Amino acid sequence: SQSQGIQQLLQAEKRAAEKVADARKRKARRLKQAKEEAQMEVEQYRREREQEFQSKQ
Amino acid sequence: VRKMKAIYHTLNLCNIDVTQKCLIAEVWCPVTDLDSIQFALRRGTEHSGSTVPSILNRMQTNQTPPTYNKTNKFTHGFQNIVDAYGIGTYREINPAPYT
C-alpha cells in the first residue's frame, strides 16, 4: 500500500500548492482593495480639510 | 569523518520525494532484523530533533534477494570456502554446516 500512501501525499502536496497560489491571488486582491480604499480615504480627507477651510474662512 | 562519508554515501543511494523534502529507501531485511530496525528507527528518530515517525511499509512482492548466511568466529571460515565456489541460491540448502 506504499504506492497509495505516496499518491495520497501527492494529493496533499497538490492541495498545498493550490492553497498557496490562492493566497497569492488573495494578496493581489487585497492590494487592489487597499488602493481603492486609499482613494476613498483621500476624498474624505479632502472633505474634512475643505470643511475646516470654509470654517476658518 | 569516515563514518560521516559513509552516511552521506548511503543517503545518496535513495529517491528524493517531491511532495515533502523526504526520502524513500528500500532495504532487504528478515523479519528478525525488521523488528530490531523498527526499534532502531525509534531510537534514531529520537536522536533527531524532529522525531519523525518514519514509516517502513512491508512489500508483499518479493525481489530476488542476496544470500545472507549468519556466521561466527569459527564457522565464518567454512562459509568463505563455500562462497569461494559461489553464492548459493536464495533459500538454498547451505552446505557449510555439513562442510
Curated annotation (Swiss-Prot), chain B:
Modified residues (Phosphothreonine): T64
Phosphotyrosine: residues bearing it: Y68
Subcellular location: Cytoplasmic vesicle, Clathrin-coated vesicle membrane; Cytoplasmic vesicle, Secretory vesicle, Synaptic vesicle membrane; Melanosome
Domain of life, source organism: Eukaryota
Family as reported in the entry's similarity comment: Belongs to the V-ATPase 116 kDa subunit family.
Function text: Subunit of the V0 complex of vacuolar(H+)-ATPase (V-ATPase), a multisubunit enzyme composed of a peripheral complex (V1) that hydrolyzes ATP and a membrane integral complex (V0) that translocates protons. V-ATPase is responsible for the acidification of various organelles, such as lysosomes, endosomes, the trans-Golgi network, and secretory granules, including synaptic vesicles. In certain cell types, can be exported to the plasma membrane, where it is involved in the acidification of the extracellular environment. Required for assembly and activity of the vacuolar ATPase.
Subunit structure of this chain's protein: V-ATPase is a heteromultimeric enzyme made up of two complexes: the ATP-hydrolytic V1 complex and the proton translocation V0 complex. The V1 complex consists of three catalytic AB heterodimers that form a heterohexamer, three peripheral stalks each consisting of EG heterodimers, one central rotor including subunits D and F, and the regulatory subunits C and H. The proton translocation complex V0 consists of the proton transport subunit a, a ring of proteolipid subunits c9c'', rotary subunit d, subunits e and f, and the accessory subunits ATP6AP1/Ac45 and ATP6AP2/PRR. Interacts with SPAAR.
Protein known as: V-type proton ATPase 116 kDa subunit a 1
Organism (species): Rattus norvegicus
Gene this protein is translated from: Atp6v0a1
